[PDB]
Amino acid sequence: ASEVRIKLLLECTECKRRNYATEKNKRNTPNKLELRKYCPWCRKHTVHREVKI
């Protein structure tokens, strides 16, 4: 990673719990990530949103 190849987390938009940790390239993806992952808390897949790490 670098200053452009940042770090970030995913937040189960339903219960707002952060679940996964990944990265992106804020120049090639300056839009906040929105990915559909699985929440062990809700116990069902859910759209997760890039929050800041």
């Binding site: 770090k7 940790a21 990944t22 990265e23 790490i53």
Partner: protein, 64 residues
């Protein structure tokens, strides 16, 4: 004078009932974002220490 229990160990490790040394798994304190889920998952568990090193870490625990 009697021996002093080494606390650097009693805070990290734990002697079982059969005479083994079980310490938590090293690696997942930080720098974990790009690590696997398998790598974070497996490292959250104890591991029996090598016999030679455990033997030493028990002579430091003379009273447990």
């Amino acid at each position: 004078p009697k021996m002093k229990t080494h606390k650097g160990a009693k805070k990290r490790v734990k002697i079982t009932a059969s005479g083994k040394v079980v310490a938590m798994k090293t690696g997942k304190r930080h720098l974990n974002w790009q690590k696997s889920g398998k790598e974070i998952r497996q490292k959250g568990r104890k591991f029996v220490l090598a016999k030679p090193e455990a033997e030493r870490i028990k002579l430091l625990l003379p009273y447990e």
